Amino acid sequence: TSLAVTEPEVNDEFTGDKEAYMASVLARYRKTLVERTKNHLGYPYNLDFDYGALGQLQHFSINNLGDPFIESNYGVHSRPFEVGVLDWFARLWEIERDDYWGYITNCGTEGNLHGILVGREMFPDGILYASRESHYSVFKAARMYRMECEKVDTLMSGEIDCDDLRKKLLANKDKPAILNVNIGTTVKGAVDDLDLVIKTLEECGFSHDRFYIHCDGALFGLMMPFVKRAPKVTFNKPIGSVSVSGHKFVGCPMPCGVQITRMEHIKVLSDATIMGSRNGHAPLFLWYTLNRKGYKGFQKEVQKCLRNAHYLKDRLREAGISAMLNELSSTVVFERPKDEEFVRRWQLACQGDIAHVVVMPSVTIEKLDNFLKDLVKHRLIWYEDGSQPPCLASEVGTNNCICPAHKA
Amino acid sequence: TSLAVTEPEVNDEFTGDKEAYMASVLARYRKTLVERTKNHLGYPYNLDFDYGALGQLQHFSINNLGDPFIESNYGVHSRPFEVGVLDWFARLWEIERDDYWGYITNCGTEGNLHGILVGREMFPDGILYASRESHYSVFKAARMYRMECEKVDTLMSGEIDCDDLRKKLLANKDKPAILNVNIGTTVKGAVDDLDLVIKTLEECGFSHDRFYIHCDGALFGLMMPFVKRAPKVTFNKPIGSVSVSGHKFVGCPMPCGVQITRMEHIKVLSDATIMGSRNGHAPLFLWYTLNRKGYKGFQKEVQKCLRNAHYLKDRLREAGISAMLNELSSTVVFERPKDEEFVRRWQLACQGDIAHVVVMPSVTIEKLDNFLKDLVKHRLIWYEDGSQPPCLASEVGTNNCICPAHKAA
Ligand SMILES: *Cc1c(COP(=O)(O)O)cnc(C)c1O
Ligand SMILES: *Cc1c(COP(=O)(O)O)cnc(C)c1O
Ligand SMILES: [Zn+2]
Ligand SMILES: [Zn+2]
């Protein structure tokens, strides 16, 4: 479709027919947005937010040019808010105000673009090593920045296989190593074992001064910190940088995120942001929610998302449907709906014969129960022909599959 | 400064002390934004917009993942609006629906990043040639993308010196040419002569298919089209791509822009956007304003911005102050205020001993008059010790300078 942009009539100042046409379009649009929001499950966006308190600020063009810390003569900005937000993220990952540098990004890809660019200026001859299941932005960065990339193999879970990382590293002891570590993969919600990655690096003869790690924690990077007894991402380990998405867990009307690296790394980048003009509203949104919820509030919500993910998985198994849920994940991978109009209604994310539900704060038991009824109901129709579902052990592991051959 | 993020008390659910604290902070903030907006002149942002009509849409997380044209399973998006906006920009630069590809960017730098990346995948061995006064994003892109860059010299106006481009091109006939053409330079509001650039290229033996041009029209790229008798940027010339900023002329609460290239070029890129998640509100804002104003409305406002720029220049000269205003520009370059707290109050953009006022739609004669009074008043104070204002001819040309030595040229 398209909604054309047509010239107003010569009469328009008298008749107001444009504003009237547009009002209906927007009304119609809004209605469809409301229902799409209601019935969304597939993507890692928290749809539950109230920024009514920021209502009176929405009409200014707030723009944080360049560095959050350097001042600029453009006065319509929100740097004090940005800095407060950054400080909070620094404290979260155990780096002191004076050691870190960071900024609020447009999105998850920008974070990956920034961290990887940093890695490259650290080690201009570095190879980029990354899981095959790391996000496409990682590989795009390699192409954009003209870097050799070595795609590491993956376990069933979607984790990086650190044994294949050994092979790769050893074969390239010649040159330094730039790593992309996934804190929650797009597809299976896998968490690369940071510690085993660091371990592998050292015992392949890469000392700290000869590698750089970016942690892409878009989704789960903000959730893991609040999981008790979970390997921490922290600048107390040889971590270069961490990206995380605002529009994912926090819930924002605009996409945004937070890139945090070390001060030392940013001087060796000698304006250190990928983008120039930066949406000064994003800092306000993040400032308001962090202030409102705290470590405490985030803890509650993470625990709930895990509980509800575990609920969804259990309930799928009981219904006969094979499903999987990694540790350190709110994302449930189950067998793809057959009629993929059901996929579009529920805005599910699909690949091969698998689909996933990312359980965010906005995803509620009521809404899961609604999904489950409508799934079971449409399952009967899809498979009334005596036809059976696909076997799923290829995708998810035999220990997780329920097909006739497995019930394992 | 900073506004700390502090944990709520254990009591907070009962007392609501956080929401109360924050309300004052936001109130205080808003008040300062109101006055900063009122008295802003230096930067190329139109501050005059009413998107009250879009008020009821502000609470959804609208996200146009990847390609405007490809569908995605995420249903909270605004692709139909984006496409409508793109079509409008395609028509503006004389390229048909089926020939062009484009998207709505986060900003001007993103457009430069995209167009230059396109140039590179066209000519992996290309040299990037760009004016010295092209925006720093152009040079960042070269570094990011590991490209040889040849900084071309500039005339006094701020235009690319096409004679120095000859020299540079001829010295590198071996390899193809990727050009960045400025439709309105950050500092002097110069317009690179696109035609003379194309001309120079051809008569240095670069046929089409051995060069790529990106037009960075961040500011003026949207204004020039509505200037009568102005060299057109159009896909009817050997143009690769054109970037333009929403938050500049149109006026937006969030930064955004429009990158438009050719379909052919994007297949040779084979997801073709720099960024992944894309703010789906930006398309709505652009859709609403384009629909509301049209070619007609844009014409009015451009003509007004020129008139008012010319007003400001005239008035500066009368007051004794040396100033310059290129044709094809709403940006007035005059002698930098001495006490640069006056600079911060008026949010002026400064470099060496020069400063500029970018006359956008929101910049009004009343507001210019206010600026001029307050300038003249503070000038007397700055210079009542027999100390003199700077000479400016280095920066702007002797034909534009009024200092004692130059009144007589
Ligand atoms: C979707 C995704 C991204 C990309 O982030 P955007 O906000 O879409 O730019 C990065 N990392 C992961 C793990 C993702 O799932
Ligand atoms: C400021 C500017 C840009 C950069 O655009 P952003 O919106 O700040 O990313 C590009 N080109 C010109 C001519 C500029 O003046
Ligand atoms: Zn099986
Ligand atoms: Zn002079």
Author numbering:
A (entry chain A): 67 to 336, 346 to 483
B (entry chain E): 67 to 336, 346 to 484
What does the publication say?
Ethylamine (EA), the precursor of theanine biosynthesis, is synthesized from alanine decarboxylation by alanine decarboxylase (AlaDC) in tea plants. In this study, we solved the X-ray crystal structures of AlaDC from Camellia sinensis (CsAlaDC) and SerDC from Arabidopsis thaliana (AtSerDC). CsAlaDC and AtSerDC are Group II PLP-dependent amino acid decarboxylases, which exhibit numerous structural features common to other amino acid decarboxylases. The overall structure of CsAlaDC or AtSerDC is homodimeric with two subunits exhibiting an asymmetrical arrangement.
Through optimization of crystallization conditions, we successfully determined the crystal structures of CsAlaDC, CsAlaDC-EA, and AtSerDC at resolutions of 2.50 Å, 2.60 Å, and 2.85 Å, respectively. Additionally, His308, Gly169, Thr170, Lys309, and Ser347*(‘*’ denotes the amino acids on adjacent subunits) establish a hydrogen bonding network with the phosphate group of PLP, consequently fortifying its attachment to the protein. Similarly, in the latter structure, the pyridine ring of PLP was sandwiched between the imidazole ring of His201 and the methyl group of Ala284. The N1 of PLP formed a salt bridge with Asp282, while the O3 formed hydrogen bonds with Thr252. The phosphate group of PLP established hydrogen bonding interactions with Lys314, His313, Gly174, Thr175, and Ser352*. The superposition of amino acid residues in the substrate binding pocket of CsAlaDC and AtSerDC revealed that all residues are identical, except for the substitution of Tyr at position 111 in AtSerDC with Phe at position 106 in CsAlaDC. The results revealed that AtSerDCY111F acquired alanine decarboxylase activity, whereas CsAlaDCF106Y completely lost its alanine decarboxylase activity. These results suggested the Tyr111 of AtSerDC is also important for the selective binding of serine for AtSerDC.
